[PDB]
Structure 1
């Protein structure tokens, strides 16, 4: 009665039930399996899905809007995709639907992030193949040594009213291309923090206004978290973003937790019992009660594949 260990999965939530799909361990987890975690009790439940089952992937980007699951991109056995899936989780045994969206989709990619705002799914960044698009792409020279890949700063809207892709004209200093950054939404602000770009794992924090499409760099007073990728960034209030884990430039696995205070524009390191449990490429979801549920991810450097310590642990932070 317990999901198998994994990194690079997806977790999304309604604040009470956490849904978990995909990822890989030591290859991929079964595509048709949808593990559900009750946040109040603490038990699991696996359901097989039918329909347009998406392929088994890592680095996919997923959201829950009114108990409907949406999924974009990721990396499967044959590379990155820009396929978009939804899955109504209110219904019968659940069924995936692959939406053949109108307009020009994002390039195929993984390890990106998304903001939910009104009718809009707004995607940012990623790693995948070369894109006639709005934004900048930046090759990762190590991927030439097949299909070479790289990072982008693309912003993409999927309007769920007509399921049509588009790109907003943004103003301001957009963050550099990046992937394995973390995205968080509060009101009309799409926060992105950290991520890997070229040869760094970064500590910069920006937000995109989802009304005015203005990019703003935030410069907090005092101590900031160390640069990182594969971290999780979670809204826990109208005013606080909860950050945990990740992976540094110098390949350190991270176990530190922080809250970003939006009103104060200040970081606050959060002390917790899980300091021996660093994680990366895990997922985080907020509970309605007031918690952040960390599931899965790896404990050490996942880049050493044959030694990777992938996890099925639930970590619970009282924020």
Structure 2
């Protein structure tokens, strides 16, 4: 039985190069077009993209609630989780899960971090500099403490919430080891307060792209140089993408970034792909056979074989919950090309399916297989 998951958006999915861990999320209920059905609390839909399959497990411990819009990383196969918007509002607690253990059931653990906490908010960006996590931006409630950055309230949240929200550009260092909050002084022109913005990590350079300042959805590119805390706005030459939101700037190489999808101000979901070169400093458009599938609030993650794999998203708009029709498809975008293991894999699936067909197959050199097989002898039975 192939465990097909429920169609969803808002889930967090993290990649070590072998597994996306998919957790949390919400969906539009197809039976009841009245309220958005939040997904179950314990569900981990782990999709191996190297062995391309689904495996759902259940977790234990100090379990956080049903999150749609959180911020999660996976450092040395360890989940860290912050922020998000459960069914009664937003949170600002910190949670940790160990994904290295396979013998025992996975136990969550809430960690009360020392230092000044941020506000309860979601839709923010992360960059990972060694053991430190810098948190930037987002949408949510007002900052309770004296927090660096500019908070600007959304007016229409006044017409749709008991407590009004707004965007920010607040940076926060959380340590992964000592669990210390700190908040350094940044330099340069800090960008606009925004939500559904794109974060990408090369070195100590963190790139933020896109988002929706006020109600407009643009396409400006900024980067923070975290060793110097310097904000620089970078406008690339040549052709450029249009203004969008809900796009994941997933890196594919140390010179080259990949972007899938988008969502314009007119509330249209985009079905185009772009790549960016840092050294040429140029966006250039990618041609792909998934131009019929626009996705927003999706998870586009990086594999070790140079494939950007997208799970989730909605084929139409996500604003009206009755108009939301989610998707659970797996989308492959290999800007970095496929490997010889994968060209052997399309050599079998297209040209050996109907084929039954020289009797000479010896072997001379030994132990040249140890990055190929893995779990090999228990397969097929």
Bin of the TM-score, shorter chain as denominator length: over 0.9
Contact conserved, 1:282 with 1:295, CA < 8 A, in 2?
Answer: yes
Map 1:1-319; keep pairs closer than 5 Å.
1-26=3-28, 27-91=37-101, 92-131=104-143, 132-145=146-159, 146-317=162-333
Q: CA RMSD in A?
A: 2.6
Secondary structure, aligned partner of 1:191: strand
**Quick one: distance in 1 between partners of 2:95 and 2:77?**
14
Q: CA deviation at 1:90?
A: 0.6
Q: CA deviation at 1:234?
A: 0.4
Contact conserved, 1:158 with 1:165, CA < 8 A, in 2?
Answer: yes
Contact conserved, 1:240 with 1:260, CA < 8 A, in 2?
Answer: yes
Secondary structure, aligned partner of 2:242: coil
Q: CA deviation at 1:11?
A: 0.8
- Cα offsets for 1:80-138 (capped at 9, x unmatched): 11111111101110011111000011211111110011110111111110111111101
Secondary structure, aligned partner of 2:156: helix
**Quick one: distance in 1 between partners of 2:106 and 2:53?**
20
Contact conserved, 1:234 with 1:286, CA < 8 A, in 2?
Answer: yes
Q: CA deviation at 1:147?
A: 0.5
The count of aligned residue pairs is 319
**Quick one: distance in 2 between partners of 1:2 and 1:85?**
27
**Quick one: distance in 2 between partners of 1:276 and 1:213?**
41
Unaligned runs of 5+ in 2: 29-36, 334-379
Q: TM-score, normalised by structure 1?
A: 0.98
Q: CA deviation at 1:222?
A: 2.2
Q: CA deviation at 1:307?
A: 1.6
**Quick one: distance in 2 between partners of 1:3 and 1:240?**
32
Q: CA deviation at 1:252?
A: 1.2
Unaligned runs of 5+ in 1: none
- Cα offsets for 1:251-282 (capped at 9, x unmatched): 11011101111111100111111000000000
**Quick one: distance in 2 between partners of 1:238 and 1:232?**
16
Stretches (4+) displaced over 6 A:
none
Secondary structure, aligned partner of 2:270: coil
- Cα offsets for 1:190-238 (capped at 9, x unmatched): 1110011102111000111111111111110022111111111101000
Q: CA deviation at 1:175?
A: 1.1
Contact conserved, 1:87 with 1:97, CA < 8 A, in 2?
Answer: yes
Q: TM-score, normalised by structure 2?
A: 0.82
Contact conserved, 1:105 with 1:166, CA < 8 A, in 2?
Answer: no
Q: CA deviation at 1:182?
A: 1.0
Contact conserved, 1:72 with 1:84, CA < 8 A, in 2?
Answer: yes
Q: CA deviation at 1:299?
A: 1.2
**Quick one: distance in 1 between partners of 2:177 and 2:81?**
16
**Quick one: distance in 2 between partners of 1:228 and 1:239?**
23
Q: CA deviation at 1:2?
A: 2.0
- Cα offsets for 1:53-87 (capped at 9, x unmatched): 11101110111101001111010111011111111
**Quick one: distance in 2 between partners of 1:202 and 1:23?**
26
Q: CA deviation at 1:168?
A: 1.6
Contact conserved, 1:9 with 1:22, CA < 8 A, in 2?
Answer: yes
Secondary structure, aligned partner of 1:76: coil
